[PDB]
Ligand binder design. Sequence first.
Ligand SMILES: CC1=C(C(=O)Nc2ccc3[nH]ncc3c2)[C@H](c2ccc(F)c(C(=O)NCCc3c(C)cccc3C)c2)NC(=O)N1
Ligand SMILES: [Mg+2]
Lengths: 623, 58, 339
Amino acid sequence: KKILLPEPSIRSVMQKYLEDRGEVTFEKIFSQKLGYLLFRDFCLKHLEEAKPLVEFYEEIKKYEKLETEEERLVCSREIFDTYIMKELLACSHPFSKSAIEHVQGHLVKKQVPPDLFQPYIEEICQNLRGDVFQKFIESDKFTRFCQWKNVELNIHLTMNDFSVHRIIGRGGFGEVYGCRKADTGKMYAMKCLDKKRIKMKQGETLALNERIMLSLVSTGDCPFIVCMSYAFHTPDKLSFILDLMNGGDLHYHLSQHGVFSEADMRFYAAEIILGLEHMHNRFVVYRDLKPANILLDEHGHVRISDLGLACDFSKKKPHASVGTHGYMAPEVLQKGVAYDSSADWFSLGCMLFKLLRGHSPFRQHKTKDKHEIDRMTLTMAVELPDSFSPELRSLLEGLLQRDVNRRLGCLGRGAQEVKESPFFRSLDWQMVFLQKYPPPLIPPRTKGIKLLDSDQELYRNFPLTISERWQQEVAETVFDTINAETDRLEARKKTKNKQLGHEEDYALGKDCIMHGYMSKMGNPFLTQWQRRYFYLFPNRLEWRGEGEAPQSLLTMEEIQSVEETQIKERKCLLLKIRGGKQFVLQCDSDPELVQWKKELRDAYREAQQLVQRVPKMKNKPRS
Amino acid sequence: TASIAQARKLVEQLKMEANIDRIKVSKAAADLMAYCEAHAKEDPLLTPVPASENPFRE
Amino acid sequence: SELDQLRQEAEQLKNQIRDARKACADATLSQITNNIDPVGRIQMRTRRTLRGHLAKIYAMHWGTDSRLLVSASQDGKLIIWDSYTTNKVHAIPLRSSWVMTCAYAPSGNYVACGGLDNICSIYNLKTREGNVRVSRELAGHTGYLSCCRFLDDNQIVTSSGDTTCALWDIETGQQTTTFTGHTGDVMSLSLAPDTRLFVSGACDASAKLWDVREGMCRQTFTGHESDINAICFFPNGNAFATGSDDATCRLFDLRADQELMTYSHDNIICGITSVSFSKSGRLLLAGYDDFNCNVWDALKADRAGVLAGHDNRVSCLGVTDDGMAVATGSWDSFLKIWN
Ligand SMILES: CC1=C(C(=O)Nc2ccc3[nH]ncc3c2)[C@H](c2ccc(F)c(C(=O)NCCc3c(C)cccc3C)c2)NC(=O)N1
Ligand SMILES: [Mg+2]
């Protein structure tokens, strides 16, 4: 059910697994929520030198988030007085003259931007990377990191990991459900897509693409996009775990409430824009912007969802007619013609027009003809009704510019251009981003297809965890209680080691390369797995069950190859031994498998290389 | 090999090895035979001993 | 050219040595010992088996008390065994797994071992604390430690794949003397009983006699066609025996400065790992890569016995100072004691 950390022994493998990948740098640990979380608990409590530093980082963090200038006036002085002035007066303030000056000079001018202390941020980091960091590494807090990271890198999801509940959306390829991730209890949406239903309509790209898109957009915890924390599949289904939006879509609410006042529409656009901005900054165009892809959360705030038809352009540029009819730009519909961000802004206008007027602007007399809308858009600036205000009128004009070279939000500052329309004159954009505006609308309360190897190969790299999203998820749910519970289990077993007296550590004071549990086949006849504590040395692999020291081993000389093998659909190591004999090893987690394979491999190679230059150790001919 | 000093060293070594006093093999032989005979009494592996004085039987 | 001359002159001197030697080859040991009775049945039996090492055994040495012994193993440990009881007095987890050799000091206060770490680690057995700690890490070799034998509790001689041997002052950790001359990895050494001399066997197929107190080689014996893997002093100190990968042992006499006796049979193709004489030197025991120890008649050269209780290579052996017994250690993870 709930998350269970490995024992601190796991440190041996993970530290190496991570070292090999270059992940034990301050930069890479500190920027991970759980990394940070542990690194501080370490500074704040277990080192007099770093307490003040982090304490200082944190206070600047809290400062960045303050909304009033009249609040930043207050906090800047206090921060200056506690972390800067005072430490100066005892010469224990180790930062560049440059940083002190930058702040002080601003305080007397009384200019208090949120990035006031950005120069201290860079430099508090400077102090903490280094000796402070290497001590962190040495500590039990980095152990805790390895333990958690071990969990992370061994996530394998199944519908079973989730508690599915009501259906909240259907489409071409499957359904969307509200659900809760058992582990941690966090609420999510699960979008399932039936692979058959896919092959059927030949939408193998849309799915595969929605995934890659989701994976580009889902970092950053954007509150205006329905981002993804995970994706896994079954042989039947594709699964996306996404932000949960239980208020349905705008397209429905337009129906139910009817066309929107300008002021009500201002809200939706505000938030939608920030969503677009988010994507556009990651070189992704939504392409399909319309009311039905704008979902409402429980409170009326909206998000852009369903990046099916979205599209990356951080290198090559799209050109195809994609999007819904009524919202596609000219340079979209016009095949051949490349494009970028531009289209969304266009659709944006089309879309906002629709929320005001009940139909797309290129859809007079309730025509239902695709070809009819297409061509009008290509060349016909739009009839903007008597009732529309000039601020609006301006905004739509700007957006629905058929000329992309002079299109609002297409002149090299993107989103920002649009935030400045007189239409939004009256909005504080931080307040939009903090979702502090009151939302207008509060939501109320068959085939014979088959599934080949060549089909399933298409979804091979579909599975995925988003580290940020998982760590955040953990951070706010179970991270704290799990840490205590685990802390308690470990320091208990420190005592049942000390009574029993096994208090020496068998891996120390020699040349042990690595250790940790793995399981092997005990009985040749019976074929079950005994979990044993192994210790790799340069010339042998020793193992032991509880209490006793190792009373068996392999020698790196015996080992001829190391390979993966399936056993009962579990990935395992297959060591071939010299006599013709074999040896099989199961590891508790993917990284443990990657490492034991690498290190066993490395060590057997080494050993045989080495033995070959040692006349007393080498094999000689026999006949 | 092409080091003048190593070739010198080598040569002085062979000189030292060359000008030793050697004895005829016949005498050297006899002296080993002699030793062997004079000490075969004291050699547990040469004469199987009684288990009584043999620390590895009881 | 001076180099060209020094080459010729070494060559003359090699020849002069060869003729000097032939001038002593008036009789053979074989001839001389044609009279004496054979030695008869040498049937020895496994008394103890020493079970404990988890991997191959590379070497062993008896305490002078003819009871204790250290053995060094691929499992990365030394075990000091009480052979009477088979009790592990000490098991010593080494700092490097690549141990090849080991030695019991005469006093029985220390042991030594080393290997691919190129270090002769001196372990001390009795502290007042009652602990087994690394007392010295004798470093200086630039190659594996192949053999080492304590002169007393403060000087020790080593041999190494760096082709050199050396004498150390334990207290200080200094390499007080360096013995050079060999052109291939030095594999084994044996101390004379007076300990003012020692001999070393090497992968250059030559064995060499050295003066401990003077640092030089007195004599160089050749004739083997391959690596000398092991070497032992005849107990009186005027001869030694070598074992080699060429499948022969040989007895070389110091004062006659030459081979007296090849111990060989057409049946034996495998190489020798280890040699040792019985107390009177009459018996020459050799460990082989065929898994057996052959007991040879030092004087007649007849094969006289076979220790056949190992499943892999016999890697090392030894006879007790008291004469009573013979350890054999093996790649099969065991030591067997024999008499
Ligand atoms: C946004 C959206 C749907 C939807 O509800 N998605 C969604 C996403 C994340 C969420 N988090 N919390 C709730 C939530 C909901 C829902 C939906 C659900 C599942 C789907 F597979 C699809 C979909 O892919 N429709 C393709 C349209 C189609 C084509 C191109 C061809 C033939 C037939 C059809 C229906 C669409 N309908 C829709 O119009 N758009
Ligand atoms: Mg186009």
